[PDB]
Amino acid sequence: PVARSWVCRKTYVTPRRPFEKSRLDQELKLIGEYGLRNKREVWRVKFTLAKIRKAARELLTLDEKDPRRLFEGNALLRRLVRIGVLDEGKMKLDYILGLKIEDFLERRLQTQVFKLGLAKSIHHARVLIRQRHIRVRKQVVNIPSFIVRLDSQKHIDFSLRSPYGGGRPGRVKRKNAKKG
Amino acid sequence: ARGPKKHLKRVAAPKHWMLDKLTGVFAPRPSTGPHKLRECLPLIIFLRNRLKYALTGDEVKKICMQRFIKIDGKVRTDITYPAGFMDVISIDKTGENFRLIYDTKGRFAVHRITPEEAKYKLCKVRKIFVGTKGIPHLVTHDARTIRYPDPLIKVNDTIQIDLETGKITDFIKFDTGNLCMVTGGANLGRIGVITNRERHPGSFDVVHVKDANGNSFATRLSNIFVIGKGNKPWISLPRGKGIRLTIAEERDKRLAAK
RNA sequence: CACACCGCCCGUCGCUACUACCGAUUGGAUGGUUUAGUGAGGCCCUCGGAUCGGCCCCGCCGGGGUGCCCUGGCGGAGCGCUGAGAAGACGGUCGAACUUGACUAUCUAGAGGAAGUAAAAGUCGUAACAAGGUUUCCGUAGGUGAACCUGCGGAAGGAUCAUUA
RNA sequence: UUUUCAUUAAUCAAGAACGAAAGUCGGAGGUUCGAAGACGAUCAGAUACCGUCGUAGUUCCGACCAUAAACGAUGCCGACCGG
RNA sequence: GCCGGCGGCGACGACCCAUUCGAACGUCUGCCCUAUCAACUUUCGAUGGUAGUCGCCGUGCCUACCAUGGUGACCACGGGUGACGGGGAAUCAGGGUUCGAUUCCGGAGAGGGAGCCUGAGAAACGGCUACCACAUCCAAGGAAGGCAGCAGGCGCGCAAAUUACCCACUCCCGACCCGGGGAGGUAGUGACGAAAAAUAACAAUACAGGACUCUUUCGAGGCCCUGUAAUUGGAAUGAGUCCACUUUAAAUCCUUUAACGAGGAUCCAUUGGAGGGCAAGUCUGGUGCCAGCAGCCGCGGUAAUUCCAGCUCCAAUAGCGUAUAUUAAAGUUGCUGCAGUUAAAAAGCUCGUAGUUGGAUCUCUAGCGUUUACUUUGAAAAAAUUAGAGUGUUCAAAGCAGGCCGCCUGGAUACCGCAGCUAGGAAUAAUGGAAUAGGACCGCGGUUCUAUUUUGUUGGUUUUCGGAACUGAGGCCAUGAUUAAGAGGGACGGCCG
RNA sequence: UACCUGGUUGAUCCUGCCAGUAGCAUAUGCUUGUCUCAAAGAUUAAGCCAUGCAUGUCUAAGUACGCACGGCCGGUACAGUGAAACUGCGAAUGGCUCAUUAAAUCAGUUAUGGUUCCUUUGGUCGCUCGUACUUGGAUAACUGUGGUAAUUCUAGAGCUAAUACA
């Protein structure tokens, strides 16, 4: 006996057919558009979407007056409005089925850092985040797969320490300044 | 196995203590006493986890061994002593008195009482017997055997005992239209009024209880405790008035407060 | 048959490799049931009494009560009469384990015997697929180096859906 | 059938009756055909096909044997659907 | 301390009752394969009866005397299990299949059996006694053994870590705030497996580069893209080196942060493929049905799209091959959902017990109504796990925390086969309520006994009322049998083969 | 995500399996920068073990004449800390492993009105009509003499305690 938990979960599902043109293209488009590292990151978002869709599908089968369906449905919709893949108008359980991978990949910190014009390329954003230049609220995050909340969007600023923002020259600038 | 068990694994402890998984392998293991192991509360949990006074296990025995804590007006230094339903824990150092009442969601809540109310306690009579030259006897849910009871006290009635003495001040009969509380099963901690009982000979008697908010539920006779005469309680209630309000308005209340 | 009748293909016998079966050796090996006989150790019962105290009775004697009783020292012995009590012993019970026959699980070498599958340039014929040159096949019986042949009764999956008042 | 009984039925582990031809025991009789076998042909060889003979058998009575391409290669009971 | 006695506060004890922690015996329902296991058990207890014995008690637990029972095609009994049983795990449309030695619950055993002391609790093995198997010391007289606790070693094999440090945390034990604990915690070994995530980004140059505007073409641009440039440029930085902390029982790791640290940023990304299945080369050397590749089909015999290499390209990526058990694919085990004329397959044929299935029809007076199955509701049902609410672990797998300027919070909820309890419904499916009328419902005749009120209380007889079985009759029921299956048995009639 | 694709033929349509495809576990190959979480002598042999450790314990409150310490006050039985030993309790929990075990174990449900129970928590404890202002004997520890090659082996001799034994 030991005081440790063994609650570990797989976050991606591999495709049934390993080599298939039309599919490989579609995944590489997603990588190319949102500068993802490998196809695991696309399968991760497919798996999460699939689980949300399966939850919506298994909720639909219950009657419209059931307390459980009402409570669970509202909670799911609230969370998907909170994360920012829907709006208050389209907040019906039926519309959960009308989402896709694009909607979820748009909410990556990498994507938002590129879309707000902090970085000048989708590839630059991932590096900039990973190099500890970017911060949300007063918290320095270096996770490209940080899924940004709707209300947390309006402040992604450069971390104050950073050379780009804070105002402290790095190794290259220091070395060039000493030999200048 | 051979002889009685002495340990208790952490995950095997009863859920209403809310011990987390990672802190250790073992648990408190309430020692033998008036209340059952499954339905009691160790002082180590009450002090450390609920009142947030002690951090580690040593600080709890450092509190208790200095003899600052009484249970029902009697000093207990045993940190794993079982204090259960209606038991009054008294801290005369800081002048704080608590009665152990179950809350709505079915666990012992940190419900403070005035020092004037920490004088008596209500108790459900388990049996009634007589022996040795006929001095009749009574036995209650917290194992307090009392001699010469009032002959109007029958089985499943409630009695109010002054803690300084060991004598019955007043008693409540178990009849229709009396305020009761559930102490076992799905409906644990719900307060309501008796509507009727359905006697099943050679089996458990089932009672029907109507809540203050028009909610009607059933329960076994063994898991009933009369707390009030008519509708008026003889003790203070927890934060909520024992009203089981559902997840819908739980969310509405939580979001309304925000 | 499609490399197309210069086609395909059957069995005996022959060489090689790999499996399995049968088999005298009343074959060993391990393990489990048990007939019969023996019986370590504890536990129980009936005895037993190595030792260890106490009660006692006088010899030499102090004080108190009044020749006798209580009170303090010591040594002797009474199969005196009471308690404790170890070794050992008959009997009882649970009973490991041991000696000898019987029943039986699996593995296990074996002279010699008799099969199957794969190997494709071995040898002798050509049984089958065309009416395959004796239509083929089934059941059963007998006989031949081998495929097979023959009797008797069926089947068409035949080479005939039909043969005439 | 303007008779009777009134659900007594359907299909079936176990368990039963029958079951071509050949085949094995005892009895009867043996005309034809005819496994085995003896010859005569054909053949490179023929241990077969073709022909002459011929034992068991083919036939009957009493015991076994329980199999066939025992085939419509198609289980049985009930409803509906074209001439 | 109070006027020589009387006392307050505890601690050890204590026959017995209650209680808590249990434990032990039971009740009902539920388990894998096997008929090349069809009858088993009962001499020596099998099933039951009476009396005991023994035991903490109920009981064939055991003895005595009796009875002859008990279980079984609804699968007994026997054998097998690479069988500890559950909570669960993997996979997955719906149904299912497979695994579950392994951290929680229950059981069992300390090499194999057997017997027992002590104690509330043991048939205890880090207690003892004996035998069986192994084996240690020895002065040969005797003595001492038990890792399937933590390390570690040998063996076995395809298969598995350190003779480490600490009671600080979670708890346990003791006369006990103070002692001890290889329970447990913390490091070391660790590509069992799971989560996040490096190996570069931007700017400036030229393209017999691309798109957008002008010219019919040639040829014209700070509008937007581009690489196989070791071309040009500073900006950013974690890997490592190493102060100081913080973390910790003491350390480590992480987080924090001085100093150093990027131009083949040589601070170098691998493992498998490139004929089809199946994404990627009919490019160039070599070998010549030899060497080898190839899960399968096939490629190799002198121009090899497949072998050994070079170059190039594809796939997944800090991982990717290979082998083997298992799941989906497998509607190739078929309940949902498969086949059986010829592909593998309906018994040669009929009877027949068990098994399964079975035609219309019938609109409440504290006890009932004819009893179930079915269906809906209720209570009971350990957490962990799974689903799922809340919560920015920096995100996530997680965790059960946290949030506001002493406070306001949370630690929900759902599911939990079957069977057993509980209250409604009465369609559907079984069963029966009156047929030689001892049938229902009503008042009427008697036999025996009894209730325990009564003659103010008290003793003897006789009573009624309260309550039963047995009967001798009577009135009434609209008195009691549904139909007769294009279900089936049987009867009879004239034929038929 | 309720999925299929190659392979019998000169070609076709089938039945049918072999092969491919993805997941999960054990092994193993080659490769291996950062960080968190984390299984791990189960399968074969419940086969066999050197060595070290894993169960001990004292409060004001059962027994203190060990100078092992110094301290009063010196006619004060016992100032205190306290080794050792007697006494009390624990060692039947925990941990390990899966050989056994097929209505057995075990799971859900009920019963003890048929039984035991240390401990805790309550009740009870002059309810009995018959030397007490404290009774008796020993043995550890300690001292002293020993035996055996040998073990957590122990005999003999001299004192002394009780909440031990009476």
Those nucleotides of strand F lying less than 7 Å from any protein Cβ are 1, 3, 21-24, 37-39, 91-96, 110-111, 118-124, 127
Residue whose C-alpha is closest to residue A99's, from A53, A51, A45: A53
Q: What is the largest CA-CA distance in chain B?
A: 66
Q: Is the CB of B197 under 7 A from strand F?
A: no
Contact A152, A137 (CB under 8 A): yes
Say which residue the tokens 């036995």 belong to: B139
Collect all residues with Cβ–Cβ distance below 8 Å to A151 and sequence separation of at least 6. Answer: A82
Technique employed here was: cryo-EM
B253 reaches A (C-beta below 8 A):
no
Proximity of residue A16 CB to strand F below 7 A? yes
Q: Chain B contacts of A3, Cβ < 8 Å?
A: 10, 21-25
**What is the chain A residue with the closest CA to B9?**
A1
Asked if A70 lies within 8 A of B248 by C-beta distance, the reply is yes
- Dist CA B82 CA B32 (whole Å): 7
Contact B190, B178 (CB under 8 A): no
Chain B interface mutation, best of A5, A68, A71, A79, highest count of B Cβ atoms under 10 Å: A71
Phi, psi of A6 (to 5 degrees): -115, 35
Given a contact cutoff of 8 angstroms between Cβ atoms, the answer to whether B172 and B157 are in contact is yes
Q: From chain A, pick out residues whose CB is under 8 angstroms from the CB of B27.
A: none
Resolution, given in Å to one decimal, reads 3.2
A3:B24 CB<8 A = yes
Name the E strands within chain B.
Answer: 69-71, 88-91, 96-99, 112-113, 120-131, 135-140, 146-147, 158-162, 168-172, 179-182, 191-198, 206-210, 216-220, 224-226, 228-229, 232-233
Pairing assessment for the beta strands A134-136 and A156-158 based on DSSP bridges: antiparallel
CB B105 within 8 A of CB B127: no
Structure token digits, residue B238: 């927890």
Q: How many residues does chain A have?
A: 180
Virtual torsion, Cα A76, A78, A81, A84, nearest 10 deg: -70
Tell me how far apart the alpha carbons of residues A109 and A111 are, in angstroms, rounded to a whole number: 5
First to last CA, chain B: 53
Q: Give a three-class secondary structure readout of chain A.
A: CCCCCCCCCCCCCCCCCCCCCCHHHHHHHHHHHHCCCCCHHHHHHHHHHHHHHHHHHHHHCCCCCCHHHHHHHHHHHHHHHHHCCCCCCCCCHHHHHHCCHHHHHCCEHHHHHHHCCCCCCHHHHHHHHHCCCEEECCECCCCCCCECCCCCCCCEEECCCCCCCCCCCCHHHHHHHHCC
Which token pair is A166?
């804070």
Judged by a CB distance cut-off of 8 A, whether residue A6 touches chain B is no
Q: Is the CB of B203 under 7 A from strand F?
A: yes
Q: Could you give the CA distance from residue B244 to residue B81 in angstroms, rounded to a whole number? A: 30
The 3-state DSSP class for residue B3 equals coil
The Cα–Cα gap between B61 and B44 comes to 8
Distance separating alpha carbons of residues B135 and A11, to the nearest angstrom: 72
Cα separation, A160 vs A119, whole angstroms? 16
Of A85, A74, A98, nearest to B251 by C-alpha is: A74
